[PDB]
Enzyme design. Structure first.
Site, PDB file in Angstrom:
ATOM      1  N   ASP A  55      28.693  -1.922 -43.186  1.00 16.75           N
ATOM      2  CA  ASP A  55      27.671  -0.836 -43.351  1.00 16.75           C
ATOM      3  C   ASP A  55      28.398   0.342 -43.745  1.00 16.75           C
ATOM      4  O   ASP A  55      29.627   0.420 -43.369  1.00 16.75           O
ATOM      5  CB  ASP A  55      27.041  -0.629 -42.341  1.00 16.75           C
ATOM      6  CG  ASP A  55      27.754   0.129 -41.000  1.00 16.75           C
ATOM      7  OD1 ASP A  55      27.444   1.532 -41.270  1.00 16.75           O
ATOM      8  OD2 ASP A  55      28.156  -0.201 -40.159  1.00 16.75           O
ATOM      9  N   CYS A  68      26.036  -3.217 -65.390  1.00 23.25           N
ATOM     10  CA  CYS A  68      24.716  -3.203 -64.516  1.00 23.25           C
ATOM     11  C   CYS A  68      23.529  -3.460 -64.930  1.00 23.25           C
ATOM     12  O   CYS A  68      23.354  -2.843 -66.003  1.00 23.25           O
ATOM     13  CB  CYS A  68      25.041  -2.185 -63.722  1.00 23.25           C
ATOM     14  SG  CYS A  68      23.828  -1.861 -62.255  1.00 23.25           S
ATOM     15  N   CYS A 106      20.789  -2.497 -63.288  1.00 19.24           N
ATOM     16  CA  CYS A 106      19.622  -1.677 -62.539  1.00 19.24           C
ATOM     17  C   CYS A 106      18.662  -0.824 -63.561  1.00 19.24           C
ATOM     18  O   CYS A 106      19.096  -0.635 -64.679  1.00 19.24           O
ATOM     19  CB  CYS A 106      20.325  -1.001 -61.288  1.00 19.24           C
ATOM     20  SG  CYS A 106      21.153   0.553 -62.020  1.00 19.24           S
ATOM     21  N   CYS A 121      20.837   1.977 -65.285  1.00 18.31           N
ATOM     22  CA  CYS A 121      21.677   1.575 -66.291  1.00 18.31           C
ATOM     23  C   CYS A 121      21.092   0.902 -67.293  1.00 18.31           C
ATOM     24  O   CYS A 121      21.336   1.070 -68.539  1.00 18.31           O
ATOM     25  CB  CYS A 121      22.703   0.551 -65.718  1.00 18.31           C
ATOM     26  SG  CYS A 121      23.760   1.446 -64.518  1.00 18.31           S
ATOM     27  N   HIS A 124      21.230   3.167 -58.347  1.00 17.56           N
ATOM     28  CA  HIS A 124      22.547   2.466 -59.047  1.00 17.56           C
ATOM     29  C   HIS A 124      23.596   2.098 -57.939  1.00 17.56           C
ATOM     30  O   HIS A 124      24.122   1.074 -57.823  1.00 17.56           O
ATOM     31  CB  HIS A 124      23.358   3.309 -60.077  1.00 17.56           C
ATOM     32  CG  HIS A 124      24.575   2.743 -60.489  1.00 17.56           C
ATOM     33  ND1 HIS A 124      24.399   1.466 -61.315  1.00 17.56           N
ATOM     34  CD2 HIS A 124      25.614   2.849 -60.051  1.00 17.56           C
ATOM     35  CE1 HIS A 124      25.827   0.999 -61.331  1.00 17.56           C
ATOM     36  NE2 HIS A 124      26.686   1.792 -60.552  1.00 17.56           N
TER      37      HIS A 124
HETATM   38 ZN   LIG Z   1      23.330   0.385 -62.460  1.00 16.50          ZN
END
Ligand SMILES: [Zn+2]
Ligand SMILES: [Cl-]
Ligand SMILES: [Cl-]
Ligand SMILES: [Zn+2]
Lengths: 361, 360
Positions: B258, B296, B298, B301, B327
């Site tokens: 974490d 990436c 996401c 992106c 992101h």
């Molecule tokens: Zn991303």
């Protein structure tokens, strides 16, 4: 550019605009971005709310990031990731609200609110910027009174001369151009300004210079005066304001388009716009509430979270509370306008207006 | 239930079955403090592929307090998160406080909200976490900073508190993890691990590290601890979950991690990419038409340029922070997915070598 009124119920109009990036049914509320973003929202959030069009200011965009960076993106739509229509404000209200500006018929010099440097703005430059941004609807550059009667009169006449110049410098394709009616609270000036711009000829007509402080009754009477001289076959756009009870009063007087930072801004202060009126999530009456923000709302926020949890987020200073209310508030505005459109089609608009005006005192 | 499916050296590919879902390991847990991961919705977390998050409990105990979470029938409902939650017992938060009085009974400290005197002990901690209904609870521990005598006292107290935590843990459908202490002292680490495994927990956390000691001792103490922890139960390194340390620790047998690092640094304008940190505030982004991470997928992106994100920060738009938080969590969940795929395919050392190079 095409606009059609499909049904009228008194002065209320059900219409549709066909813009380069999409069709927009009217009456329509446009969420407002300043800096090429609606605060706290993604384009996805806006699409899921059902927003068919948003407003961008450009006074700030002209300053930062500037025209050249938005050209690299091949336009504002690409820059901000929004693929549906955009209307760009020409920034008259912002510019003429700045202290120690120098105004004449050529244009205005002001200090940048970003870095203090001296900037020159005029109709030709404003058109240039908006053409570079590529918005579906551009506004002419106006002289918005910041004002006594003589001042309002000077700014209204100058607004006419700048409307001509804006139209002349507007050399593009796939972009509509709206004129802006001025005249303050003076019906003679408002009538004259509407006839002036109407004689020039635009794709639509905005009503400028209202909901900036004058009494509400004056806001409504001046809209009526202007709308009397604006063609029925073009959109009517009231600039600013955007409270639910104002928008309903104005629809009932023949206005088609609206914008305000009101729903996004009050979300960040912790207030939801619901079908029952404003709900203050910071009030202690929510601290133990297991109810959603609005029982009649289908948004992400109302589906997943309790008033208790959102109260908690504001109590702790979590920006997620502001995000959740911004999502709800924009959902609510789009849903209000869809209700308005439905009520005009059904002839139940007076019933709707009475219920909205009742809870938005 | 926990099962190691494959090992590659000491790196383990595993799966935990928790009340609200299964969790593949190694796993990074996004961290929240006030029943939220800052700037993220549960939908963002799900779309990132987060199978579990961590909630702190120190502040939740004070605001909104346990009774209001109980009205919701627990924390998952309160925050709208339907997957597993690990709750921290607050030992690092109490370690982070100025001027506390600690003894065998518990710890007194002044409220971060109020200034009022608050009392916390193992029994109260278990009662809070039971009320929250998290899938994994942590024992209440005493985390030291320090001389061997001082570290040994805190480690001994941690044992006594682990006993008391387990005895107060009267619930169902919640796992309870013990926390190994011992500072930078191998003999104390070995004894702590032996004491906690003699009690018996559902998993074992490695506590008190990455809080200021040299990196070489973080790593060595992890090795010493892991030697005395069961291979059929999860190993959890508490905190400090930056990419290169996570990889070094996976390579030593640790399963769970974490950190607030990814969310916090997003808010300061820094993206975690497959090429290392990228500062979006740096003026070289001003005209960049590239996404934050070409590797990436996401939301951020797929839709925006470094120019636009840079601009959002330039103008103080919190949207810039939201987008980099999306992101950065995507990056962390994806990093762990690749770790798992690499253990399965035996390519873990190539992954490791890359992470270590760019997160240098
Ligand atoms: Zn991303
Ligand atoms: Cl309540
Ligand atoms: Cl926050
Ligand atoms: Zn809602």
């Amino acid at each position: 550019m095409e606009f059609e009124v499909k049904k009228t119920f008194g002065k209320a109009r059900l219409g549709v605009m066909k813009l380069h990036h999409g069709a927009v049914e009217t009456p329509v509320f446009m969420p407002v971005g300043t800096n090429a973003s609606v605060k706290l929202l993604t384009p996805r959030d806006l699409e899921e709310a059902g927003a068919e069009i948003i407003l961008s200011n450009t006074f700030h965009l002209m300053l930062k990031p500037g025209v050249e960076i938005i050209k690299l993106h091949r336009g504002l739509h690409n820059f901000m990731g929004w693929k549906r229509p955009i209307l760009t404000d020409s920034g008259g209200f912002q510019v003429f609200s700045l202290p120690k500006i120098r105004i004449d018929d050529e244009g205005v010099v002001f200090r940048s609110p970003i870095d203090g440097s001296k900037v020159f703005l005029n109709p030709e430059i404003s058109m240039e910027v908006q053409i570079a941004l590529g918005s579906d609807i551009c506004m002419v550059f106006d002289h918005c009174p910041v004002a006594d009667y003589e001042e309002v009169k000077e700014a209204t006449e100058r607004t006419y001369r700048w409307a001509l110049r804006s139209k002349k410098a507007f050399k593009t394709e796939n972009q509509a151009l709206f004129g802006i009616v001025q005249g303050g609270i003076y019906p003679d000036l408002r009538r004259e300004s509407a006839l002036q711009l109407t004689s020039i000829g635009f794709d639509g007509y905005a009503i400028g210079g209202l909901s900036i402080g004058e009494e509400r009754s004056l806001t409504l009477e001046m809209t009526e005066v202007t709308v009397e001289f604006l063609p029925e076959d073009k959109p009517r756009y009231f600039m600013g304001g955007g409270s639910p009870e104002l928008i309903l009063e104005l629809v009932d007087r023949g206005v088609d388009m609206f914008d305000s930072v009101f729903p996004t801004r009050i979300a960040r202060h912790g207030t939801a716009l619901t079908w029952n009126g404003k709900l203050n999530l910071k009030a202690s009456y929510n601290k133990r509430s297991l109810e959603p923000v609005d029982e009649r709302c289908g948004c992400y926020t109302c589906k997943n979270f309790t008033r208790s949890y959102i109260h908690h987020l504001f109590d702790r200073g979590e920006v997620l509370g502001q995000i959740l209310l911004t999502i709800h508030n924009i959902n609510f505005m789009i849903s209000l306008m869809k209700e308005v459109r439905r009520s005009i089609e059904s002839g139940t608009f007076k019933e709707l207006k009475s219920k909205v005006v009742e809870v938005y005192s």
